[PDB]
């Protein structure tokens, strides 16, 4: 009997080779004697190559391998919300089993050209430095790239928390993170109330390479259920770089020839297949959407590296966080020159699109002129621009941790910045100016905020100027 | 009988064993059509292309779709001919995949329509046309330093996220809307969102009435990513030959073809070469590139975007494709970071139309002087950094003063860029560009501020921008 039963020939480093399995199909799940599950990749003439999805210590030569008849699948359903699971869907938080009754394939085709729609719905993250000059829309994919200890996880968690009052499911996938770090992230989500609509998929650094390679696909497959039911999903991949490292480990264990930086040839395909599946579906397909926020960690801020370039070449824009700016007090550390959003304009409300259109280019020019100005003198217009605008934009784009700011207040603050109302105050006074301006707005100008909330447009021609002048009349300077 | 059996399945590569004496020829198309015999199987509908003859009546093939669900032992059908795609007037206004099957939901192509094989030899030496004429694009840098040649081959080099897609869209907007001939777009290994947006924009603008579009994207397997460009080229070749019409050919990313070739090379038994590329990198690229040419019976002008991995211009794929182009524009991440779009490198960009007898001495002298000034400004950077600005001679101070303004004036606002910034954009004639750059070189605009030259059209808009700033 070699039709649905096999025998192990070799075991080592998380991969196995089995004899028999005549009728096994490529990509099928297989089960060892211990109950550990496996994946069939290579159907050679005389043997089948199997990747072990779990602890391979208990597997020995001569053990029996039997078919399951199903292509690689994960359990999906509504009951998975609020739980912490592994890439295989097994519960990990210890709160009992999971009552899902449906499965989806890990490898699924992406929506076609005619199944998509242009992105037109803003995704307010609550951060000025994102919502102003790097807008994110529903169905877009936008990676956060930077060095270690720069705030990428903080940005992701704040974005997840900000979606409390909207009907959208959030998925957080941790690839290669410390178990304690994942525990603390889950605790913060529980404290802020995000666990009512969040699914956490974890694969720590102690797990074998196959699970690290498989986890993001499990997360996206989980999101596909809600996307095709007509709902909106946000998915976060925590280290696509660690996924690439695990895939390189697996490929070199399979003795595939290495390319640039010892990565396999299909390293670009690995990421493109995953990231291409997030899309904004059309009305015929139900109008659902899936938003992806992949993460890439650079070395010494080198954006020219192979993996960063590969991931940038796939997504719809990047948010570059700089360590040199993270230090010295610019905590958001947004680098306007290297950042870009390719769905800009359409991913913003009409007011914000009207106000903050040119900010990214303005700060890029300001950084260039600041770099150049170290050598010599400046013209009158250069001195006006560099200091009255760039220095104040850099200061007003700064934001504190866990401080969501409504878009109706953001449009006000960038309008005041752009119209030149901040030129007469010192640079150090702008944060107190912003705080007192928000207080004054809440106290007196609630009707402008209501008009912006209801119409998504600017409130008035001259009443806005009048209100800003009224606030400036009572603001104490220095 | 021409019946095959599946022996090995290794990712996107499948080995098929045929009966002795009936092996299919290389590049032939094989079909697998299997219905699930029970609950432990899935339905299969897959096409394969013959790649190698391994001996023992065995053939190694490349799959055009996912190989999941394949069981070794399945039946394979030999069609006896390479992949054939529908061709003719029926392809205008339609969107096709790699196999020539429409994906626009507008209806199926009739089964009796004429079809042409994908693989064909390149045109001979005696059939080539040789005549250089300027193709005006309305872009200042392109029109001044590296003019495009009508009927020639144009390549755009750039890294990840530098702007070559936006440049392609701007060129389509400027040229294709009034070309009068036939336009063909081939999307190789790019974003489905970008493809959908381009299709909808063409439908809105009405250009789609005379445009044939073929799409194989990054989510598709390497076989499709290799053959989609050949399908598009097969359509363009018919439009050139059988009707003698001018053809616009846009290829979204030609680097993905060689990337997929390198990905599939390792499973074909080839030894690695250079940094990991296949040994046949040059011949495979040449066989495809040499088919994109203008002949005596029809002219094809093609604009190709070429991706540069890891921003390394010495990589073999960008390096070997340089010799296949007549005009090239090189984008730079350094210029992109400075905010001066389209970030075309003014020195590395070259073209064969930049000659005194083609563009005139008035144009040629201005272009050469601009290049010389920019080169001197580039050289002065180290001495400026390590000695200060005040230590330069009055000649070098003037050189820097002129060069910064020239570099800023090289930037432009694009029509397709209105979705990113609120500026509407502009179209600048070659005469206006030459006159403006000559006036800047003459020192007429030395009193204006530096930033007044950024993202404007004609030289006048600099004056109005300075007046708005308050000079
Ligand atoms: N806006 C902010 N204001 C203040 N502190 C912040 C802000 N954003 C992040 N931090 C702090 O910066 C530190 C690093 O943040 P975070 O853990 O999110 O970074 P990271 O890049 O994901 O790190 P790692 O590589 O360790 O996973 C933390 O102490 C966090 O509290
Ligand atoms: N000329 C320009 N004017 C305004 N914005 C621009 C210009 N060129 C590029 N950008 C901005 O930079 C982004 C670069 O994206 P784009 O698709 O053009 O890059 P690319 O070179 O094709 O990269 P990739 O290899 O990822 O496809 C644009 O989406 C836009 O936001
Ligand atoms: Mg982190
Ligand atoms: Mg592109």
Question: In the 3-class helix/strand/coil scheme, how is A345-400 assigned residue by residue?
Answer: CCCCCHHHHHHCCCHHHHHHHHHHHHHHCCCCCCCHHHHHHHHHHHHHHHHHCCCC
Contact A361 B339 (CB under 8 A): yes
DSSP, collapsed to helix, strand or coil, labels residue B279 as coil
What CA–CA distance (Å, rounded) separates A25 from A105? 14
User: Among candidates B110, B233, B248, B259, which has minimal Cα distance to B178?
Assistant: B248
Of the candidates A330, A308, A342, the one whose C-alpha atom is nearest the C-alpha of residue A134 is A342
Sign of the torsion angle spanned by Cα atoms A50, A56, A57, A59 = negative
Whether residues B12 and B104 share a domain: the answer is: no
From B67, which residue of chain A is nearest by alpha-carbon distance?
A26
Q: What is the CATH number of the domain that holds B384?
A: 1.10.1140.10
Residue whose structure tokens are 């040119």: A358
Name B61's Cβ contacts closer than 8 Å, sequence gap at least 6: B13, B14, B15, B16, B30, B48, B49, B50, B51
- Given an 8 Å threshold on Cβ–Cβ distance, is A43 in contact with B9? yes
Counting from 1 in the atom list of ligand 2, the atom nearest the Cα of B305 is 22
The pair of structure tokens assigned to A92 is 């990990």
Radius of gyration of chain B (CA): 26
Q: Which structure tokens are listed for A266? A: 């299909």
Q: Tell me which residue has its CA closest to atom 3 in ligand 2.
A: B417
Can you give the three-state secondary structure of chain A, one letter per residue?
A: CCCCEEEEEEEECCEEEEEECCCCCCCEEEECCCCCEEEEEEECCCEEEEEECCCCCCCCCCCEEEEEEEECEEEECHHHCCCEECCCCCECCCCCCCCCCEEEECCCCCCCHHHECCCCCECCCCCHHHHCCCCCECCCECEEEECCCCCHHHHHHHHHHCCCCCCEEEEEEEECCCHHHHHHHHHHHHHHCHHHCEEEEEECCCCCHHHHHHHHHHHHHHHHHHHHCCCEEEEEECCHHHHHHHHHHHHHHCCCCCCHHHCCCCHHHHHHHHHCCCCEECCCCCCCEEEEECEEECCCCCCCCHHHHHHHCCCCEEEEECHHHHHHHCCCCECCCCCEECCCCCCCCHHHHHHCCCHHHHHHHHHHHHHHCCCCCCCHHHHHHHHHHHHHHHHHCCCCCCCCCCHHHHHHHHHHHHCCCCCCCCHHHHHHHHHHHHHHHHHHCHHHHHHHHHHCCCCCCCHHHHHHHHHHHHCCCC
Look at residues B359, B393, B421 and tell me which one is the last residue of a structural domain. Answer: B359
Task: Give strand pairing partners of A298.
Answer: none
Q: What is the dihedral of CA A180, A181, A185, A186, to 10 degrees?
A: -30
Query: Across the interface, do B103 and A114 touch by the CB < 8 Å criterion?
Result: yes
Ligand 4 midpoint to CA B331 (Å): 12
The number of beta carbons lying within 10 Å of the beta carbon of residue A476 is 7
Main-chain dihedrals φ then ψ at residue B71, nearest 5 degrees: -120, 130
Q: Which residues contact B184 (CB under 8 A, 6 or more apart)?
A: B211, B212, B213, B214, B232, B235, B236, B239, B247, B248, B249, B250
Are A316 and B70 inside 8 Å of each other by CB? no
Tell whether B432 and B345 lie within a shared domain.
no
Please work out whether the CB of residue B164 comes within 6 Å of at least one atom of ligand 2: yes
Which residue(s) pair with B295 in the sheet? B128, B298
Chain centre to alpha carbon of residue B88: 23
Q: Which domain holds residue B67?
A: 3-78
Question: CB–CB of A318 and B161 under 8 A?
Answer: yes
Q: In this structure, what token pair is assigned to residue B272?
A: 């690695």
Q: Across the strands, what pairs with A321?
A: A146, A334
Q: Nearest CA to CA, how far is A439 from chain B (Å)?
A: 31
* Cα separation, A52 vs B26, whole angstroms: 37
Asked whether residue B120 falls in the same domain as residue B238, the answer is yes
Place of tokens 């010494």: A300
Whole-number Cα distances in Å, A421 to A132, A394, A466, A473, B108: 18, 16, 12, 12, 62
Residues B159 and B224 sit within 8 Å (Cβ to Cβ): no
Q: Give the Å distances, CA to CA, from B342 to A58, B157, B167, B460.
A: 59, 12, 7, 20
Last residue of a domain, one of B328, B344, B359: B359
Does one domain contain both B329 and B366?
no
| Residue B370 phi, psi dihedral angles, 5° rounding | -60, -45
What is the sign of the dihedral through the CA atoms of A450, A451, A452 and A456? positive
| CA pair distance B211, A477, nearest whole angstrom | 62
Angle at A278 between CA B228 and CA B218, to 5 degrees: 20
Nearest of A88, A109, A118, A113 to residue A100 by alpha carbon: A88
Q: What angle do CA A381, A384, A387 make, to 5 degrees?
A: 140
Q: CA-to-CA distance for B329 and B343, rounded, in angstroms?
A: 10
Domain CATH number, residue A90: 3.40.50.300
* B257 and B145 together in one domain: yes
User: Shortest CA distance to A464 belongs to which of A319, A304, A351, A359?
Assistant: A351
CA gap A198, A214 in Å, rounded: 20
> Ligand 1 center to residue A401 CA distance, Å?
9
Could you tell me if B371 and B294 lie in one domain? no
Which residue in A131, A163, A121 sits closest to A289, CA to CA? A121
CA of B288 to nearest chain A CA: how many angstroms apart?
Answer: 22
Breaks in chain B listed by the residue before each, with C–N > 2.5 Å: none
- Between CA A222 and CA A76 the distance in angstroms is 6
Shortest-distance atom of ligand 1 to CA A321? 21
Check which CATH number belongs to the domain holding B280 and give it. 3.40.50.300
The answer to whether the beta carbons of residues B220 and B284 sit under 8 Å apart is no
* E-assigned strand segments in B308-454: 327-330, 350-351
Structure tokens at A267: 């390293």
CA of residue A35 relative to chain centroid, distance: 34
Question: Do B70 and B171 have their domain in common?
Answer: no
Q: How far apart are alpha carbons A110 and A118 in whole angstroms?
A: 16
| Sequence-separated (6 or more) residues with CB below 8 Å from residue A64 | A5, A6, A7, A8, A32, A33
Indicate if B184 and B241 belong to the same structural domain: yes
B60 annotated ligand binder:
no
Q: Residue A354 and residue A345: Cα distance in Å, rounded?
A: 9
Q: Which residues of chain B does A257 touch, with a Cβ-Cβ cutoff of 8 Å? A: 266, 272, 276
**Where does residue B45 rank: exposed (0-12), middle (13-18), buried (19+ CB within 10 A)?**
exposed
Interface of B with A in 109-148 (CB under 8 A): none
Smallest CA-to-CA distance from B245 within B215, B212, B214, B213 is with B212
Could you give the CA distance from residue A194 to residue A184 in angstroms, rounded to a whole number? 13
End-to-end CA distance of chain A: 87
Nearest to A352 by CA among A437, A422, A409: A409
- Strands B134-135, B148-149: pairing is antiparallel
Residues 6+ apart with CB under 8 A from A223: A169, A171, A233, A235, A290
Helices A152-161/A179-192 angle, 10° precision: 30
Angle at B383 between CA B407 and CA A385, to 5 degrees: 45
Q: How many CA atoms lie within 13 A of B15 on its CB side?
A: 17
State the DSSP code for B339. T
Contacts of B387 (CB under 8 A, 6+ apart): none
- Cα of first residue to Cα of last residue in chain B, in angstroms, is 85
How far is residue B411's CA from residue A194's CA, in Å, rounded to a whole number? 46
Picking from B78, B112, B138, the residue at the C-terminal end of a domain is: B78
Collect residues with CB below 5 Å from ion ligand 4.
B 165
Please indicate whether residue A404, judged by its CB atom, sits closer than 6 Å to ligand 1.
no
- Looking at the structure, do residues B377 and B316 belong to the same domain, yes or no? no
What secondary structure letter does DSSP report for B465?
A: H
Q: Provide the number of structural domains found in chain B.
A: 3
Q: Using an 8 Å Cβ cutoff, are B408 and B340 in contact?
A: yes
User: How many Å lie between the alpha carbon of A46 and the closest alpha carbon of chain B?
Assistant: 9
Beta carbons within 10 angstroms of residue B39's beta carbon: 8
- The preferred substitution site among A154, A184, A295, A297 for testing ligand 1, maximizing ligand atoms within 8 Å of CB, is A154
Other Cβ atoms within 10 Å of B300 Cβ, number:
26
Same domain as B178, residue B111: yes
How crowded is residue A65: how many other Cβ atoms within 10 Å of its Cβ?
24
Q: Judge if B412 and B336 occupy the same domain.
A: no
Is there a contact between A116 and B196 if contact means CB atoms under 8 Å apart?
Answer: yes
**Angle ∠(B201,B207,B213) on CA atoms, nearest 5:** 80
Q: B437 alpha carbon to ligand 3 midpoint, in Å?
A: 50
Interface contact B40, partner A, CB < 8 A: yes
Domain range for A127: 75-354
CA–CA distance, A423 with A415 (Å, rounded to integer):
13
Q: How far is the CA of A332 from the centre of ligand 1 (A)?
A: 9
Q: Which residue has the tokens 């993270």?
A: A326
d(CA B142, CA B412): 11
> Are B153 and B43 members of one domain?
no
CA distance linking residue B469 with residue A325, whole number of Å: 30
**Residue A423's closest CA among A377, A379, A368, A385?**
A385
CA angle B324, B325, B330 (to 5 degrees): 125
**Is the preceding peptide bond at B342 cis, omega within 30 degrees of 0?**
yes
Residues B330, B299: Cα–Cα separation, whole Å: 25
Q: How many CB pairs under 8 A join A and B?
A: 182
Residue nearest to atom 28 of ligand 2 (CA): A342
């Amino acid at each position: 009997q070699v039709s649905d039963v096999g025998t192990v020939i070799q075991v080592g480093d998380g991969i196995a080779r089995a004899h028999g399995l005549d009728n096994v199909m490529s990509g099928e799940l297989v089960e060892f004697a211990n109950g550990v599950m496996g994946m069939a990749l290579n159907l050679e003439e005389n043997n089948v190559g199997i990747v072990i999805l779990g602890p391979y210590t208990g597997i020995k030569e001569g053990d029996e391998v039997r078919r399951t008849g199903r292509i690689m699948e994960v359990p999906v359903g509504e009951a998975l919300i609020g739980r912490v699971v592994n890439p295989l869907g097994q519960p990990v938080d210890g709160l009992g089993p999971v009552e899902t009754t449906e499965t989806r394939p890990i490898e699924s085709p992406a929506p076609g050209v005619m199944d998509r729609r242009s992105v037109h719905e803003p995704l307010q993250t609550g951060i000025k430095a994102i919502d102003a000059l790097v807008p994110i829309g529903r169905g877009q994919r936008e990676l956060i790239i930077g060095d270690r200890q720069t705030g990428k996880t903080s940005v992701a968690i704040d974005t997840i928390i900000n979606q409390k009052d909207q009907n959208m499911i959030s998925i957080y996938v941790a690839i290669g993170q410390k178990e304690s770090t994942v525990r603390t992230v889950v605790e913060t989500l529980r404290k802020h109330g995000a666990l009512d609509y969040t699914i956490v998929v974890t694969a720590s650094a102690s797990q074998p390479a196959p699970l690290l390679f498989l986890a993001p696909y499990a997360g996206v497959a989980m999101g596909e259920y809600f996307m095709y039911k007509g709902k909106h999903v946000l998915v976060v991949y925590d280290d696509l770089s660690k996924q690439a490292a695990a895939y390189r480990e697996l490929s070199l264990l399979l003795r595939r020839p290495p390319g640039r930086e010892a990565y396999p040839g299909d390293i670009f395909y690995l990421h493109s297949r995953l990231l291409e599946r997030a899309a904004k579906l059309s009305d015929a397909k139900g109008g659902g959407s899936l938003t992806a926020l992949p993460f890439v960690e650079t070395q010494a801020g080198d954006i020219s590296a192979y993996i960063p370039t590969n991931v940038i070449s796939i997504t719809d824009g990047q948010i570059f966080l700089q360590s040199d700016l993270f230090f010295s007090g610019v905590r958001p550390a947004i680098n306007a020159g290297l950042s870009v959003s390719r769905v800009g304009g359409a991913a913003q409300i009409k007011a914000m699109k009207k106000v903050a259109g040119t900010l990214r280019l303005d700060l890029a020019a300001y950084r260039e002129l600041e770099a150049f100005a170290q050598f010599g003198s400046d013209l009158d217009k250069a001195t006006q621009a560099k200091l009255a605008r760039g220095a104040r934009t850099v200061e007003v784009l700064k934001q504190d941790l866990h401080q969501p700011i409504p878009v109706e207040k953001q449009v006000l603050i960038i309008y005041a910045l752009t119209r030149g109302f901040l030129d007469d105050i010192p640079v150090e006074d702008v944060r107190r100016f912003e705080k007192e301006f928000y207080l004054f707005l809440d106290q007196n100008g609630q009707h402008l905020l209501e008009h912006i909330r209801t119409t998504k447009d600017l409130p008035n021609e001259d009443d806005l100027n009048k209100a800003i002048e009224a606030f400036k009349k009572t603001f104490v300077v220095s | 009988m021409t019946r095959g059996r599946v022996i090995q399945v290794m990712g996107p590569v499948v080995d098929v064993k045929f009966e002795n004496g009936h092996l299919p020829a290389i590049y032939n198309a094989l079909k697998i059509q299997h219905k699930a015999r029970n609950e432990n199987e899935v339905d299969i509908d897959l096409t394969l292309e013959v790649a190698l003859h391994l001996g023992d009546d065995t053939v190694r093939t490349i799959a055009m779709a996912s190989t999941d669900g394949l069981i070794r032992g399945m039946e394979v059908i030999d069609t006896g001919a390479p992949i054939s795609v529908p061709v003719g007037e029926v392809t205008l206004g339609r969107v096709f995949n790699v196999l020539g099957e429409p994906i626009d939901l507008e209806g199926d192509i009739p089964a009796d329509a004429r079809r042409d094989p994908i693989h064909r030899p390149a045109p001979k030496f005696e059939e080539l046309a040789t005549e250089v004429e300027i193709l005006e694009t309305g872009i200042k840098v392109v029109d001044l330093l590296a003019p495009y040649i009508k009927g020639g081959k144009i390549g755009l080099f750039g890294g990840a996220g530098v702007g070559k897609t936006v440049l392609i869209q701007e060129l389509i907007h400027n040229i294709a809307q009034e070309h009068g001939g036939i336009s063909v777009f081939a999307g190789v290994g790019e974003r489905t969102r970008e493809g959908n947006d381009l299709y909808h924009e063409m439908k809105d603008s009405g250009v789609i009435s005379k445009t044939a579009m073929v799409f194989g994207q990054m989510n598709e397997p390497p076989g499709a990513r290799m053959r989609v460009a050949l399908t598009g080229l097969t359509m363009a070749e018919y439009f050139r030959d059988e009707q003698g019409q001018d053809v616009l050919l846009f290829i979204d990313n030609i680097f993905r073809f060689t990337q997929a070739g390198s990905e599939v090379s390792a499973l074909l038994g080839r030894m690695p070469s250079a940094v990991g590329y296949q040994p046949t990198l040059a011949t495979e690229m040449g066989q495809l590139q040499e088919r994109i040419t203008s002949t005596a019976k029809g002219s094809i002008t093609s604009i190709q975007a070429i991706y540069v991995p890891a921003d390394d211009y010495t990589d073999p794929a960008p390096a070997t494709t340089f010799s296949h182009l007549d005009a090239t524009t090189n984008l730079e991440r350094k210029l992109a970071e400075m905010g001066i779009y389209p970030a075309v490198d003014p020195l590395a960009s070259t073209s064969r139309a930049l000659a005194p007898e083609i563009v005139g001495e008035e144009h040629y002298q201005v272009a050469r002087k601009v290049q010389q000034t920019l080169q001197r400004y580039k050289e002065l950077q180290d001495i400026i950094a390590i000695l200060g600005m005040d230590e330069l001679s009055d000649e070098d101070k003037l050189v820097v003063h002129r060069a910064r303004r020239i570099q800023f004036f090289l930037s432009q606002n694009f029509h397709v860029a209105e979705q990113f910034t609120g500026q509407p954009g502009s179209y600048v004639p070659v005469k206006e560009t030459v006159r403006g750059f000559k006036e800047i070189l003459e020192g007429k605009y030395d009193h204006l501020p530096e930033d007044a030259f950024r993202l404007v059209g004609r030289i006048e808009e600099v004056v109005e921008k300075a007046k708005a700033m308050g000079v």
